[PDB]
Every structure is written in C-alpha cells, then in structure tokens.
Design a protein around this nucleic acid. Structure first.
Ligand SMILES: Nc1ncnc2c1ncn2[C@@H]1O[C@H](COP(=O)(O)OP(=O)(O)OP(=O)(O)O)[C@@H](O)[C@H]1O
Ligand SMILES: Nc1ncnc2c1ncn2[C@@H]1O[C@H](COP(=O)(O)OP(=O)(O)OP(=O)(O)O)[C@@H](O)[C@H]1O
Ligand SMILES: [Mg+2]
Ligand SMILES: [Mg+2]
Ligand SMILES: [Mn+2]
Ligand SMILES: [Mn+2]
Ligand SMILES: [Zn+2]
Ligand SMILES: [Zn+2]
Lengths: 348, 356
DNA sequence: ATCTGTACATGTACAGAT
DNA sequence: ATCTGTACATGTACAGAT
DNA sequence: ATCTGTACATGTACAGAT
DNA sequence: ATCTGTACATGTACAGAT
C-alpha cells in the first residue's frame, strides 16, 4: 500500500524522458562522431548504453545516463593483478600508450573536452576529473541537470578470465544455456583510476559486465514470459527501485555513507534473485514480503561484511579494505531503524 | 511404466549413433566441398542439419538424417501461389550464377533441383570407400536422398533450400503463436531469422509446376524442440525434467508402426504428428502440464487431440494458419477415418502395436 | 610482405552408458 | 550420480592467394 | 564501411470495466 | 482499488542500400 505509493513517486514521467533523451542523444552522437572520421587512436569505437536508465530501473528523474565507448583490441595478453580478481594489466594505433590505463584515458578525455568546447547549442561542460572513476562525466543543463558518464572500454573476444570461471551462477535461475551463451559474449575492461597511492594503480584496468547485467535485467524470469504482454508481472525490478531509493535517501542525509553506491544494491539483489529463482517468489501481491526479505539479505551482508562481486566471486565488495567496519555498522543501524518504523525516510 | 519400457526400446544406442554419424558426416562433407568448386551455381551453399536426429527425437535406429544445403538469394521477389499460404513463385528484379535457371524473371525450381541432383549423382559416383547410391527421384520431394549401406541401411535427405533474410511472408503474421509459452521476445528473435524455400516438385499438371516453391521452417522447429519449456531450466542439469519429447517419440512410433502395416496410411507422415504436438504445447504451456510422472495422460491427451484433428478434418500448419494439412483436398475422409479407428483401437486395448 | 576462406581449437549442453 | 561421444557456436591459424 | 528503415521490446498515461 | 485495451514514447537489432 505504502510501497505502491512510493513507486508512483519514483516513476519517471514520459515527457521528462523524451526531453532529457534527445539532448543526451545529441551530445553522445556528436562525441561518437568526433572519435571516428577524425583519425584518432579511438577510430572504430562503438556505442553501448549501460546502467539504470537503459535497464529501466532509473528512479525519480531521468538525470544520469551511462554510455560505453567500446574498442576492440587483439593481442590482449591479460595478467591478473595481485589476486584481486577484478583488476588486470594489459600487454600484447595504440602504440602511443604495457597498455597504460591512465595514458589512454587521458587522450580520450582530451578529445572529449575539446569537442565539448565546440558545442554551441546545449549547455554542457566536462566535470572535473574524479580520481577513482573511469568515466568522463558531462554535466548538461536543459535547464535541469543531467549527468552523463562516458566510459572507455577495451573489448576482448576471448574466453573470460579464469577469475570469473565460478561467477555468474545463474544455472538454477536463468539456466545453463543462457549462461554458456552469455559467456560467449565479449568482456570489457575499464580504468581503475583511484589515487589510493598504492602499487601499479596507473596501468590497472578493471573488468566490466555492464552488457551482461543489462541482459539479466531484461531477461530476469525463470519463465520466458515474465513481465511480457502475455506473461505475469513480477516485482523484482520494483524491489531494486525501492532498495535503490532507500540508499539514495540515506546517502543524501549522511556523509558517513559516502562509500556506498547503487552497485552495492545491484549486486545484493543479483544474489537474492539467484537465491529465490521462482517467479512466484516475486508476485506483485507480495511486494512487501520481498522488499523486507531483500532488506534482511542486505543486513546479513553488512553483518558478515561479505558482498561478493556477482561475476568475480573472490572479489568482496564489503572487504575491510574498501569499507570501514564502522561504515557498515552505521548503515546497518539506519536501515534497521527505517525498517522497524515503517520507512519515514520515504515520505520526505 | 508400460510406457517407460517402450521408450527404452525406442532409445538410440551410442555405438549405432557413432557408426552412422561417422559415415554420414564424411559423405555430407564431400558433397558440400564439391558444391563450392568451379562454376558450380551452388558455390556459397551452406549446411544446416535439421529433422528428428538433430532434435533428439529420432526413434528406433539412427537411420534417417535430414540436412539443408541452403543458398542465400537477395533483391526482393516472391509471389504467393493462389492464396495457398505455403507456396510461392520466386522472381528477380535484378537481371549471375542463377541465370541458367531463370524463365524470364521466374526462377525454376525443377531446373535448379535437376542441376543440384546431377552434381550430387556425380560426386557419389566417385566415392569408392562407402556403399552409397542415389535414390530414384520421388515426386513431391525437394530432397536428393542418399542410401548408405553401413552395412546397415541409412537414408540422408539432402534438401536444396533458398535462404531469404527479409521479413517473413505475410501469410505467417498470425503463425507461430508461442507468446504464452515461449514468449514475445523469443517470437521476435525467431522471426528475425531467415526463412527458407524448398522446391515443391510435384508433377500434378497444375500451372507453374516446375517453378513453385514451398516455405520451410525446419530451423525454427529445431530451436523449438531444443528450447521447449516455459521455464528456462526445463530438462537442463539444474532444472526439472519434462516429458514433452517423450510424448512426441511415443506418437512418432504409433504412426511409424501403423504405416508399416497398412498401405491406407500412406498420406500420413511424421510432420503431421509434429505439427499436432506444437499445438498441444501451445495449449498446455506450463511445464507442470508435462510432468514425467503423468506420461500416460500426456500421451493420452495428445491422442485425443490428434483424433479430433482427423475427424474434424483440421490440422493447421503451425507457421501458416490458413494452410490445412488435413484438408479434403490433401487426404481423403476415408483415409482419415481409417487412422481414426486404428488410433482409438490402440488407445482402448493397452496399445498392442508397441509390443510388435 | 599482407590478406583470408578454410579448417582447426575450444567449451559445453544433451543424453546414452555405466 | 558420474563418465562420455556427438553436435554446434564462436574464436583463431595459416597455406596459398594478393 | 555508414546510415536509414523496420519491427516490436521496454516503458508512461488513462479511461473503461472489474 | 485493479485489470484491460489503446495511445504515445524511446531503445535496439539487423537487413539492405549506398
Ligand atoms: N564498482 C563497479 N564495478 C563494476 N561495474 C560497475 C561499478 N559501478 C558501476 N558499474 C557499472 O556501471 C553501471 C553504471 O553505474 P551507475 O553508478 O550509474 O549505476 P546504475 O546502475 O546506472 O544506477 P544509478 O545511476 O541509477 O544509481 C552499472 O549499472 C554497472 O553495470
Ligand atoms: N510436409 C512438410 N511440410 C513442411 N515441412 C516438412 C514437411 N515434411 C518434413 N518437413 C520438415 O523436414 C524435416 C524432415 O522431415 P522427416 O520426414 O525426416 O521428419 P522428421 O521430423 O525428421 O522425423 P523422422 O524422419 O524421424 O520421421 C521435418 O522435421 C520438418 O522440419
Ligand atoms: Mg545510471
Ligand atoms: Mg528425419
Ligand atoms: Mn554512473
Ligand atoms: Mn526426411
Ligand atoms: Zn518479471
Ligand atoms: Zn523439458
């Protein structure tokens, strides 16, 4: 009852969707164009739209879009970086860049900034670089604020790295045929651009499965008909939206929650969808029970300090090395509070 | 129980499968290489294995393989033959390797199938390691059939197919009604695949005889057979086993046994059985309506349904609704009532023909 | 020297065999 | 319940062509 | 190698019927 | 309240033309 009303608030409006989309489409097409017919090191970069807006789980407003400019590359000798599972060195046009991640992303960002300087019909700037991010982020105002993440990615057509062999455990849910075919797709690398002052950080890329997460979001039933015109609606995505919203409201209020992002909710719910594969475990009439069991799952994750990357099982997103024990214990208290008092944070 | 044991008789043996496939693959490899030589008009033809053996529903013995030699053909052509839904003339706006087979702008099917059969006959002549000859042409068949003695008898239907990548012909807009069973996404993807035309090749005395082609969906049928469930894990190693294919096998076998004994059943063929079960899978989409424990009643309802098709003289092509495979124009009422009685008899006497 | 149609290499579902 | 042959989808090598 | 055309998936929006 | 049917909107895959 309450939760249906929250979801009506979170719904994007069809007019807001078309106004933001045509501006975003304008800038992205023009930037993609500058990469090609202009003989750059990125000639042949291709576009792949990723993230919440294209998965149809964007909440509140259409104000943040995610785009991959992916580039196919051949002699890619990979070499796992110090057992982290998700970070890698790359070895063997691009002779201008070991293939250095910062070196390559710098030229990518120089080109974009240049072309953004030559855009006279939209209010669009390049956000100052965030050490920690693989993105070049645009800030558009038309007039409302829209941020766009342009993510450079290497594309490799080889088999997936050893560290993912036990990942993507969809066999009881989406099945073994879906899994084998998914793993026949390419995989993608992106910059680790964090200034932790640590080791090989500057040449380290990171695995990306944004194309696989997109498929799963739109092929999310054990039944082929789930959420189709001739099937039965489930509420899996509405739980993602509600869990994503509770963390947006908690991050807006407390800076002690700065280390948490939507990807932590996303990974948590991928495990929940695998734990509870049956589409009837997600009946719209049980929206409350499902949201509450997801909350509980996410609290068990904070209590055990354990949230494994859905595709890279040995890479713990909640390790002491990324998030303080106290930050997790903090988030836990605020979730339990919202939980056990009917979610006051939703009414503001 | 009784039906558990028929399926064990019906089950193919790996030794037999291994020996038959070794031979069959060597022959098809050689015929395919020869298609690519010289000014062969069929250079660029590609292989696609279809039929019961590759759908895993081939029963009793591995002795009949079906394989398409498909050839891609562009432009935008096609004219439906007399509102039949299934049959077409193939034209060409472009006026070239198929030029030797045109008649004006109309591509002759029996001209192409002749040159196709000629080349196969030659290459089989020069095979001196396998006992393999070319079966005398059957009217109405698009196939060039090989008979291999292995020393066991083995049939191989080489089917000549045109491949078109355009949208499917409008006579199929309402066909393939899988939206409640396999879903709309599957339907959209399946219909983005090519469609195929094979020679009609009758000598009926009808106008356009040697230039009439017939639609074929063997490739979409292979997908459906191997992806037959509402649940993605159906019959997979972390999902539940169903009994959809086991019903098709038992029914193939009922018709196979009867067609051996009685000549009256010559108008009937396994495609009729296959078509009927696609309707039954559409009527009963849930995997739970095909539980292995209810194999008896699953086979029973398919029987009832096949009987209703025979008596009401109605069995629509799964992909071309307006095409009725059981129309009086195709099979006599006398032929349909005969099989109808033979089916009720088996159904209501403990299935004696299985013990044959 | 590079290009590339052909065929080998790789991985895994399906289902027979044990 | 595990071992295993066949089919098949896609990546990759390279003898022979350019 | 590039780009438009097509079809239908995913949505929002709403009125009528339940 | 919710289910259904139609209108309206964007995203995406791929055939075919240039
Ligand atoms: N830490 C990460 N590791 C791997 N992939 C990530 C990570 N963070 C983000 N991604 C990928 O990039 C996409 C965009 O991330 P972003 O931060 O915009 O979140 P989102 O899923 O788009 O949702 P929202 O923007 O609405 O919070 C994600 O959907 C995911 O595929
Ligand atoms: N009359 C027909 N109309 C349309 N397609 C047909 C027809 N007959 C056969 N086919 C197609 O060609 C394939 C091969 O036909 P075939 O007679 O070998 O049957 P099958 O399904 O392979 O089984 P089996 O050979 O074991 O009886 C079929 O699976 C079907 O896809
Ligand atoms: Mg986003
Ligand atoms: Mg066959
Ligand atoms: Mn982002
Ligand atoms: Mn046949
Ligand atoms: Zn759903
Ligand atoms: Zn099944």
């Amino acid at each position: 009852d309450k939760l249906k009303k929250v979801l009506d608030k979170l719904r994007l409006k069809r007019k807001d969707i078309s106004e933001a989309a045509e501006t975003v489409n304008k800038v992205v097409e023009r930037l993609l164009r500058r990469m090609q017919k202009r003989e750059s090191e990125f000639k042949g970069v291709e576009q792949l739209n990723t993230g919440s807006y294209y998965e149809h789980v964007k909440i509140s407003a259409p104000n943040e879009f995610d785009v991959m400019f992916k580039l196919e590359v051949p002699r890619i000798e990979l070499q796992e970086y110090y057992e982290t599972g998700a970070f890698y060195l790359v070895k063997f046009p691009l002779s201008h860049f070991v293939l250095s991640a910062t070196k390559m992303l710098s030229k990518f960002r120089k080109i974009i900034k240049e072309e953004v300087k030559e855009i006279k019909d939209i209010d669009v700037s390049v956000e100052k670089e965030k050490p920690g991010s693989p993105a070049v982020t645009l800030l558009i105002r038309n007039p409302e604020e829209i941020s766009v993440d342009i993510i450079l990615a290497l594309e490799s057509k080889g088999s997936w790295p050893i560290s993912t062999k036990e990942g993507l455990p969809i066999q009881g849910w989406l099945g073994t045929k879906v899994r084998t075919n998914l793993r026949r797709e390419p995989f993608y690398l992106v910059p680790k651009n964090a200034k932790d002052g640590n080791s090989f950080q500057g040449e380290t890329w990171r695995l990306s499965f944004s194309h696989t997460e997109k498929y799963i979001l739109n092929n999310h039933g054990i039944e082929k008909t789930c959420c189709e015109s001739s099937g039965a609606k489930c509420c899996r995505k509405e739980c993602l939206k509600l869990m994503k919203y509770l963390l947006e409201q908690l991050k807006k209020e407390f800076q002690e929650l700065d280390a948490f992002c939507s990807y932590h909710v996303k990974t948590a719910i991928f495990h929940m969808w695998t734990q509870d594969p049956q589409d009837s475990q997600w009946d719209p009439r049980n929206l409350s029970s499902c949201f509450d069991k997801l909350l509980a799952f996410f609290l068990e994750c904070l209590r055990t300090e354990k949230l494994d990357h859905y595709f890279i099982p040995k890479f713990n997103l909640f390790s002491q090395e990324l998030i303080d024990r106290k930050s997790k214990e903090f988030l836990s208290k605020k979730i339990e509070y919202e939980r056990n008092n009917g979610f006051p944070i939703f009414d503001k």
